[PDB]
Amino acid sequence: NQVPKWIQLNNEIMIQKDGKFQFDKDKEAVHSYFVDYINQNTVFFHNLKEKLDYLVENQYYEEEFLSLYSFEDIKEVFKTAYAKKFRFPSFMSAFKFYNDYALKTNDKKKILERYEDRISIVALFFANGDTEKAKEYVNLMINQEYQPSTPTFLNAGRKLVSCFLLEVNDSLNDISRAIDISMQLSKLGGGVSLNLSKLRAKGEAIKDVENATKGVVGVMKLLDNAFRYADSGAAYLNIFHRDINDFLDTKKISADEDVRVKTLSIGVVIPDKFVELAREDKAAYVFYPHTIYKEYGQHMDEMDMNEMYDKFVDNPRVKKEKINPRKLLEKLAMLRSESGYPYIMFQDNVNKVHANNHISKVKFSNLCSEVLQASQVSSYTDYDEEDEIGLDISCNLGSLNILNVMEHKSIEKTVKLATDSLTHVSETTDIRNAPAVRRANKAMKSIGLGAMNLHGYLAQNGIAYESPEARDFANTFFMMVNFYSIQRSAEIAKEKGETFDQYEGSTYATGEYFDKYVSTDFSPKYEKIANLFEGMHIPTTEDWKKLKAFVAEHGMYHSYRLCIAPTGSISYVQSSTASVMPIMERIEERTYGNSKTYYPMPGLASNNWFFYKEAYDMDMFKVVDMIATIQQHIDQGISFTLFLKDTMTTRDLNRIDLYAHHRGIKTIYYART
Amino acid sequence: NQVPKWIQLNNEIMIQKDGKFQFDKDKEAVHSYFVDYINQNTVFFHNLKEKLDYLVENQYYEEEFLSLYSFEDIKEVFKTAYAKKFRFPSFMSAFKFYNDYALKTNDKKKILERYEDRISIVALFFANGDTEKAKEYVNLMINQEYQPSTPTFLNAGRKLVSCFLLEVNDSLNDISRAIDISMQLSKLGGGVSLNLSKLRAKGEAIKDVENATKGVVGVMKLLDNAFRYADSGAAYLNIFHRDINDFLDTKKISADEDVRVKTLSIGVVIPDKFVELAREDKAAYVFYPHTIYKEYGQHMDEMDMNEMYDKFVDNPRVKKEKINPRKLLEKLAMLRSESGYPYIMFQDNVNKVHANNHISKVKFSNLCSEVLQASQVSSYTDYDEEDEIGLDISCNLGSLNILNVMEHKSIEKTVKLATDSLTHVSETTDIRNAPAVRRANKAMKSIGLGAMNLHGYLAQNGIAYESPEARDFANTFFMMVNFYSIQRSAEIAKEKGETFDQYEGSTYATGEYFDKYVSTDFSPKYEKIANLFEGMHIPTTEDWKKLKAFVAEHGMYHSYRLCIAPTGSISYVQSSTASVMPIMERIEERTYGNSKTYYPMPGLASNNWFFYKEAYDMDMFKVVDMIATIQQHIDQGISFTLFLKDTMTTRDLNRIDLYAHHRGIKTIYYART
Ligand SMILES: Nc1ncnc2c1ncn2[C@H]1C[C@H](O)[C@@H](COP(=O)(O)OP(=O)(O)OP(=O)(O)O)O1
Ligand SMILES: Nc1ncnc2c1ncn2[C@H]1C[C@H](O)[C@@H](COP(=O)(O)OP(=O)(O)OP(=O)(O)O)O1
Ligand SMILES: Nc1ncnc2c1ncn2[C@H]1C[C@H](O)[C@@H](COP(=O)(O)OP(=O)(O)OP(=O)(O)O)O1
Numbered sequence A, B: 001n002q003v004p005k006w007i008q009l010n011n012e013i014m015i016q017k018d019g020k021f022q023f024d025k026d027k028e029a030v031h032s033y034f035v036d037y038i039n040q041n042t043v044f045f046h047n048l049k050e051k052l053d054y055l056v057e058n059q060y061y062e063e064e065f066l067s068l069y070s071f072e073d074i075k076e077v078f079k080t081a082y083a084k085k086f087r088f089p090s091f092m093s094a095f096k097f098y099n100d101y102a103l104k105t106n107d108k109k110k111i112l113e114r115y116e117d118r119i120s121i122v123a124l125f126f127a128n129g130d131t132e133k134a135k136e137y138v139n140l141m142i143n144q145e146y147q148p149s150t151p152t153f154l155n156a157g158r159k160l161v162s163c164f165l166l167e168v169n170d171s172l173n174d175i176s177r178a179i180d181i182s183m184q185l186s187k188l189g190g191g192v193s194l195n196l197s198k199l200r201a202k203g204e205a206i207k208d209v210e211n212a213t214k215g216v217v218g219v220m221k222l223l224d225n226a227f228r229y230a231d232s233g234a235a236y237l238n239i240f241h242r243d244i245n246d247f248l249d250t251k252k253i254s255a256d257e258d259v260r261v262k263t264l265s266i267g268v269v270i271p272d273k274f275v276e277l278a279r280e281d282k283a284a285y286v287f288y289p290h291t292i293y294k295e296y297g298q299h300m301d302e303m304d305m306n307e308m309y310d311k312f313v314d315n316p317r318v319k320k321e322k323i324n325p326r327k328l329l330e331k332l333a334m335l336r337s338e339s340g341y342p343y344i345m346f347q348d349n350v351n352k353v354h355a356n357n358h359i360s361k362v363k364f365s366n367l368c369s370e371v372l373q374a375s376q377v378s379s380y381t382d383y384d385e386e387d388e389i390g391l392d393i394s395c396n397l398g399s400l401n402i403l404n405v406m407e408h409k410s411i412e413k414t415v416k417l418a419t420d421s422l423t424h425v426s427e428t429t430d431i432r433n434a435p436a437v438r439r440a441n442k443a444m445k446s447i448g449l450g451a452m453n454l455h456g457y458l459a460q461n462g463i464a465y466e467s468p469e470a471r472d473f474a475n476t477f478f479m480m481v482n483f484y485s486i487q488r489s490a491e492i493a494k495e496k497g498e499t500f501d502q503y504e505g506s507t508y509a510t511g512e513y514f515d516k517y518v519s520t521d522f523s524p525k526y527e528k529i530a531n532l533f534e535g536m537h538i539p540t541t542e543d544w545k546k547l548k549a550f551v552a553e554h555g556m557y558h559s560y561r562l563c564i565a566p567t568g569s570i571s572y573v574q575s576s577t578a579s580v581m582p583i584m585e586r587i588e589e590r591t592y593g594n595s596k597t598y599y600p601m602p603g604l605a606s607n608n609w610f611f612y613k614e615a616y617d618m619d620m621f622k623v624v625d626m627i628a629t630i631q632q633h634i635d636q637g638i639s640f641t642l643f644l645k646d647t648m649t650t651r652d653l654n655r656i657d658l659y660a661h662h663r664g665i666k667t668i669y670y671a672r673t
């Protein structure tokens, strides 16, 4: 029943040594725990050969790509990994890896993989034939310069994507098909979310008899019950609906029998017409999209509301409903101050930067609230009858370290290896239930790249998070990685000799995304910011001009390359801080079980004490200015989590919303307290 | 606000005239209501031609089969119907027909069809080309000798079956497919019920990881939520399951959050192994059907429990669960005394008479608890992958009058016309969502025929319902209609030159159903019973021998011909009593709205006062003896509703269950109080 030594060492960290903390007690809490637990619970082997034979015979890996190398090359990459002798600085480093991310035994009572082993296997999977590229993947990974996504780093050749975005058409067979597809993907752990802007409203005529539609809320109840059969999902709605108030009745603070959501996150996508109508404080008009489909031929989200609003107003066919949009703004701010629900997307601001607007307009995002692509709704008829194959969205993940890239300065080769690995993931992944997402991943070849450790690295350098220096740092750095990513995508579309589909209507084929970058040089205007960027060439606008000429020469390979997700589940094993969102506490405190670990921030001392600020005590306006500074280079959206408190008010949240709509911010996340 | 005259006349019926009731006040309550309401709210026409033109142009009928006759032939059958000048004797006769069963206007504020019109249109639909057969259908219908089923008589050529029985396989794609099919048929108003004997138990391994099955109760919760999207359904389970106690937790008298059923009726199908194990008062063993499928290869209901019970006992592979079956009998009787739930089916007793036992064994029935056929479960893979087409059950309805057939004595031609009409219904009906029931209706060509007015007719003749005279009457009469139905089916399979599928393995191809009837002449042993049957030839065993030779000569057309449903919704417009279940009250009293109609039984006077007994004051044992006497001629089951009271006990209900299992009773219905 006795607490072991390393847990007591972690308890000893919080002992006030002259007003500070016993940080080095972590290390023994590392070092004893390696000795007393890790090295005493590992399965013994006599060599590498019998170890690999045990891995083969005990049915733990796909043996094919493992047999794409010799045993000597496998031992070479293993010796290369073990030549690091990686010394974990954090208790949570080993305390999450060998606890969760490491592949253990079948009874899960001993250790199988080491920290080098999983990384080397993932490197062999990413390289898939080459030994030296796998060693480069190791050097990108064993120095923690890159970290792949959670199922990607988890089940590389074992027994894959957490981003899925679909639509729904207005037929019962479509409803059953979508229910089936969500149940198919729910057992695979992928993040599946949708949007319901193409369904008929409550109390409408179902094709023969008047006043027959039970409403969308029954379908939401059905999907909420359907998600109770697996381990989660989400759905959206365009704002100009009569049941949009009922869309606010979903996440009601009085949890009803008739409305009881537990899994489906909601998010209201607001075009500029609604903030236009609420800004003038004039009464607005939502409509019936089935009457719109019966009158004009298309759904309401098929057309822009700013054009066709008065065209719906004067036309007597589509039935009206008149409300106050300012009262809806008040109730939205009220629900956001209650919880932080729902999400808000400025889809016109998304299309204001969207390169593939020639295909469609983005009208929704994921649960991770980051991916913004084009889409097409399908249509499913009966079983004997033939159906349709629309367009879908699937964007893989995987982050890098700002700190390790900025210290090791292999940034272009980092872009090379990360792009090749994400290309390999997009190639290998296949879906055999809904062929629409299969066709979408086959057609778009879309990837998503992000990064972490912004506040911890820059605050570790002695730079405030609320500095314009850090904003210019993000500006120049993401200009450089934008240069390298577009350079790599154009090189890859050259080397393949082939680009993604509908590349010609995008801004890359016309060079319009580079039109911002052929002028307006984002060279660092601050001295410490430039000195951090010293040691490497900063690409100017002429480099962007040659990049534009090379893109117009061949083409670009990925319709999207970048997304930013809250990838906080891997910061501990990356021995690093979170993503570009600033930290909340200098010391995380957890009760693991029968214990209290006290994990401080990595690099926490008294010099960066006030550089490691608190998220409850920051100006959010400088944060969204930084968000816009980063969004100057990101194609898709960024999951900006709002860091708020309980004492704030709804009208200041409204001012934040007007400020973000003024900044052209794409999406927002659930708020803090 | 004043109560109209005919309602006051109906109130005047209950006035005690020398200890009796003012029956003839019904007639003025008929006759004034015809004058003051019916003839004042009908749409005027100048002739028949403009009336039919209005029916065509106002989109009320399928015009094709109406154009399969001349206007003169239509006027001939209309003149034939109007030559009856049918005088309604009951207030509820017109009060349900022109209120509900008649096709009214689009705003439903006037009358379109007359009582002759709907009947004549239905007759033209049944004949479909012939005028004289339609007039014969009129004479069968306008004299109330036959009444078709509710959607059949309702929507004959307008804008169809209430019996659907399916199965479920053990895959998620199968689950989604069945959910889709139930949602497809729910909008069409058909009675859809299933059985869940081929699903894995709660807390079992889902194919890779141990203890992962949430259980069948979540699927039941899902189907209960899914039926909230339309206007009802049911599901069963074989008794030898570990979750069979949880099957009793469904209709729990404490309505839970976690278990809240509102639509799904349950019914436990009990083979002779369970009453064997509960009879000896020995501890029984339910099993895990997924372990059974993994061990022997088949589900548990694939094999007989009486054989394979000890083979499951000695085999250590299938995991056991040991209970007391007598305690389950006690809790079953407790729930039946609480409500009347669930249903009880002796499937071995069903197979003891089942002619198509060469196909499979009957393991379930419908919500109407009457139809017992063979079945095969399907299997549905993914969307791109190929699926299976199993067997299903769909049995049409439609009843006749014992009184009118016994008075008009056209019993063989009644069988002819009813069989041809039910054949036409089975031919015209098609399903375009689940092709399995389409294939099943195409393959079986199965019909269902029943009758009504047993207690009212025989009690109107001066015969007690609890007489063995009435039992011999039902014996001889249903022997005669069995003779005529088998004769008609054999004649029809001769005239088509073609029988139903798998006819050769049935008892009809081997003559074994006639082996009971080539001996044991069911001639009437009572004098008044025979005198009611006098005036027509009673078929002896030699007629059954020639029938057997004619069946072996060609074949029989329908795998099933007979079923008995509680068709009480049409007795009022048939001016008749209920089905073979005896009446409960001599005078039905209803509060229609702002009123109190008092509809007595048809033919209620002081002579048949004690012949019109009360169902709370009868011996149920004579009733189930009558049930077995009728079941001596019926192929399928009969929905015997239990007529019980509150003062009775559970052990007497157990004695009733043992008595019915002793009688070979197929199924039972929900009980009374
Ligand atoms: N931070 C850590 N990261 C990885 N392994 C560790 C860490 N801390 C302790 N250990 C491991 C390595 C050894 O197997 C054991 C402790 O021995 P350790 O002294 O840390 O390594 P070492 O063998 O390279 O140095 P030395 O020769 O001085 O013993 O547990
Ligand atoms: N009985 C019902 N109860 C509730 N919703 C229904 C019912 N029947 C159909 N629906 C729902 C589901 C469908 O998405 C929507 C439209 O009805 P449905 O007949 O299936 O579409 P449709 O493709 O035939 O054309 P339309 O859009 O004109 O109705 O209404
Ligand atoms: N029981 C009923 N069945 C059908 N129609 C009825 C009934 N009772 C009254 N009516 C109808 C028929 C007439 O249109 C009107 C009442 O006239 P009614 O006397 O019953 O018929 P009738 O016209 O054949 O006889 P009469 O020539 O003596 O008036 O309402």
Ligand SMILES: Nc1ncnc2c1ncn2[C@H]1C[C@H](O)[C@@H](COP(=O)(O)OP(=O)(O)OP(=O)(O)O)O1
Pocket (backbone or CB within 6 Å): A186, A187, A229, A230, A231, B169, B170, B171, B172, B173, B175, B206, B207, B212, B213, B214
């Ligand atoms: N994640 C899940 N949660 C709950 N039930 C599931 C889940 N995944 C599958 N199932 C259910 C539905 C299926 O009817 C049943 C069997 O699982 P499933 O993998 O779909 O069948 P299977 O055809 O692949 O073979 P098997 O019967 O061996 O499992 O368990």
